[PDB]
Design a protein around this nucleic acid. Structure first.
Lengths: 263, 60, 206
RNA sequence: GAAACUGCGAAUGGCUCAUUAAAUCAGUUAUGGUUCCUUUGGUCGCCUACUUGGAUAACUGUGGUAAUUC
RNA sequence: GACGACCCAUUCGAACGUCUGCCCUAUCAACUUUCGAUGGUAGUCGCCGUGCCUACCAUGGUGACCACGGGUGACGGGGAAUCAGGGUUCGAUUCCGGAGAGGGAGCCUGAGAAACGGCUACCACAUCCAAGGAAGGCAGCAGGCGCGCAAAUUACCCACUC
RNA sequence: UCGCUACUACCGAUUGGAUGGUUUAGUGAGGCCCUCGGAUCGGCCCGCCGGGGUGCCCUGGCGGAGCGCUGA
């Protein structure tokens, strides 16, 4: 087919962490270009009728977004699709609600409601340091913000708190052993645990061991690690589950113990 | 042939039909945008000069 | 049309591969510049992704440099002498990267005379005395000597250099692609290169 | 508010399996060898300026060709 | 607020390149080279790397571990049928990648095309004509002829999905 | 072995015919590039009038000369 870029993505080509069905038609939404990557996005309209169920058809979302009740990262967006991903804040001010996009231990974007006070900032990883013209530095982040004049000891794989109102980061975390980390990709996903150890290989695909407070050791690639706060002390709010990563046997035991499927 | 005489100071233009060889001999063997005296065209022209701006061959 | 494909041409074993995909726009030729020396004719060529590419035909000026004392001035490009890729290109006066050409040699002397306070090779001192001595002698009080003293014994200028000024020509090396850049540029020969290419010139012609 | 100039899309999709045996393709790797509409974030002061120059369409009117989105 | 523009970063990619993996055939055993085959040096071209191309110079490269040549009712993969274990057979075909729009070649526009619901020419077809000329490409959905053992409605509609 | 019918393959004169693909040489449409070419259309200078200003200037309208210089 191709001679230039494509503009469709089907249902069955689309990722499985949007939790799509198979008895609505061939196409799926496809996020338009933005700061996040499409195997890490949650498109906007999938949050509004395949999670929260305010809307019921795509035409309803087109009538909602135009009214400008929606924000994303403290700015106003007004389209059916926007590629919000890990560590962004949605803000509906009419309902007085604020969400956060973060991973379940299952490895899918959950509903993590939060105070409006918490929703005035987000946590951003540094990925690249690049000296611009005339002796000025830059940062580059995964949410694709270029923040000039950072403190001169902040380096890649650190994380920085950004004030959505004014940009211009107030504080930061430094990447060190024994600090608390979250996983953002790979086979292990959504697990929370301290760093414990590092491993280096000259070349590529260095790995990073992890250990949790349930006494389990696991490892993952370097570039799927994200820092959340100092040892056993997140600088963010955490959802239920909390990176335990239960076996399937124990999950069965909980459900038949509470006998929970009715209220 | 025909002609389409045009007066560009009213924006009006009219047709006339001739087949007299002599009057048309003034136009023959000359390229577009040449001017020639239209005094040959009759006795109702006596200080007129025209410019030919082109036209249409047979078969359009 | 004329193409720069890679799905033609035999593999290592002498094998052939049968025709696969039809020619495409990102594998493409477009005939050679074949730039000469003459009055400036430049053509602007649209190229892939935008970002227009200048093709220069018949240049006559390039920005050479004398990096020994670090001055670079705009000078005329007279004629070709040596082309280290082919012999035929010299005969039709084609100008490409790493040629050896001739220049006027004029501003380099003007710069030297004003800065180091000495002329180069000269036919006669008679010319200098009414005018061109006006610069060389100076009326400063105070900084007739004071400036010039620091310039002294940093101007030994080498033997192979000095003899060339008298002819009014100097041998410089094209260090640009004129057909891609739209400009001729280069550096002037010094040292062992300048000894080398003389021997090639005298070997090949004459 | 028809028409017309301008911007954008028409390189996506749909369809077929003819060509094609280290080719296609799959897993794995590489741009420190390159290009990139668009989105997102930064980049934004070395007798004319109270705003410069002159033509084309629609439109009006006259036509040609057996015939054309002429 | 809206629009536009230069550069950097980002996103969607695009393009080349690495290592490993292939059906039948020797009644195909030597193959490749100035009509560049392999390498060196310089240059041209191209978005870039590169014998891609040109000049000069060297004589290499490949093969019984099956090259080279020929054949394939051979598009490739994710898969499908059968099945104790090991296998055998199939994969045009809803997802992904590729190639092509009657057969060949060339080219315009654009960020992206060697595009065919763009263009120009040749070749094979076929249409209109006042014979001066003009116009065309259903391997898009329906539908017709032909071919055969062999395959549907010239229907309704943008409400869903995009 | 020889004789009788159905049926299959092989050799074969005809230097068989038909269709398709390779190959030397010659010829070569069309486009692109390059080198020329200049149909044709404007601009700025000198007369008369209008406006502004100091026979003259600028700009506009109108005509003619060299069409001089210049662009497309």
């Amino acid at each position: 087919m191709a001679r230039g870029p494509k503009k469709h993505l089907k249902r069955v080509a689309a990722p499985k962490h949007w939790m799509l069905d198979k008895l609505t038609s061939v196409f799926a939404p496809r996020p338009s270009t933005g700061p996040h990557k499409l195997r890490e996005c949650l498109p906007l309209i999938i949050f509004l009728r395949n999670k929260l169920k305010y809307a019921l058809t795509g035409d309803e979302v087109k009538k909602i977004c135009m009214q400008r009740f929606i924000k994303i990262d403290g700015k106003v967006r007004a389209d059916i699709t926007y590629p919000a991903g890990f560590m962004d804040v949605i803000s509906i001010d009419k309902t007085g609600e604020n969400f956060r996009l973060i991973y379940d231990t299952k490895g899918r974007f959950a509903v993590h409601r939060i105070t409006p006070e918490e929703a005035k900032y987000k946590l951003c990883k540094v990925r690249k340091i690049f000296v611009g013209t005339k002796g000025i530095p830059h940062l580059v982040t995964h949410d694709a913000r270029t923040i000039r004049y950072p403190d001169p000891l902040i380096k890649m794989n650190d994380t920085i708190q950004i004030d959505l109102e004014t940009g211009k980061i107030t504080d930061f975390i430094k990447f060190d052993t024994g600090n608390l980390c979250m996983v953002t990709g790979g086979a292990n996903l959504g697990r929370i645990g301290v760093i414990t150890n590092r491993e280096r290989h000259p070349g590529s695909f260095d790995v990073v061991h992890v250990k949790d407070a349930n006494g389990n050791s696991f490892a993952t690639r370097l570039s799927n690690i994200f820092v959340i706060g100092k040892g056993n002390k997140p600088w963010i709010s955490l959802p239920r589950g909390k990176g335990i990563r239960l076996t399937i046997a124990e999950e069965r035991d909980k459900r038949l113990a509470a006998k929970q499927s009715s209220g | 042939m025909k002609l389409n005489i045009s007066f560009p100071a009213t924006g009006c233009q009219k047709l006339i039909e001739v087949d007299d060889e002599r009057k048309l001999r003034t136009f023959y063997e000359k390229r577009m945008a040449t001017e020639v005296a239209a005094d040959a065209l009759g006795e109702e022209w006596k200080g007129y000069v025209v410019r030919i701006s082109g036209g249409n061959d047979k078969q359009g | 049309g004329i193409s720069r494909d890679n799905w033609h041409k035999r593999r290592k074993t002498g094998g052939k591969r049968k025709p696969y995909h039809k020619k495409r726009k990102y594998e493409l030729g477009r005939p050679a510049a074949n730039t000469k020396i003459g009055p400036r004719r430049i053509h602007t060529v649209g190229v892939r992704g935008g970002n227009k590419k200048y093709r220069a035909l018949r240049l006559d000026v390039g920005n050479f440099s004398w990096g020994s004392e670090c001055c670079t001035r705009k000078t005329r490009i007279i004629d070709v002498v040596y082309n280290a890729s082919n012999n035929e290109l010299v005969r039709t006066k084609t100008l490409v990267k790493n040629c050896i050409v001739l220049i006027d040699s004029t501003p380099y002397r003007q710069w030297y005379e004003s800065h180091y306070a000495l002329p180069l090779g000269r036919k006669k001192g008679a010319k200098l005395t009414p005018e061109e001595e006006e610069i060389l002698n100076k009326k400063r009080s105070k900084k007739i000597q004071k400036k010039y003293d620091e310039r002294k014994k940093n101007a030994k200028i080498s033997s192979l250099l000095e003899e060339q000024f008298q002819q009014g020509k100097l041998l410089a090396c094209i260090a640009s692609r004129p057909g891609q850049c739209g400009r001729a540029d280069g550096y002037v020969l010094e040292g062992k290169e300048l000894e080398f290419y003389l021997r090639k010139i005298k070997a090949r012609k004459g």
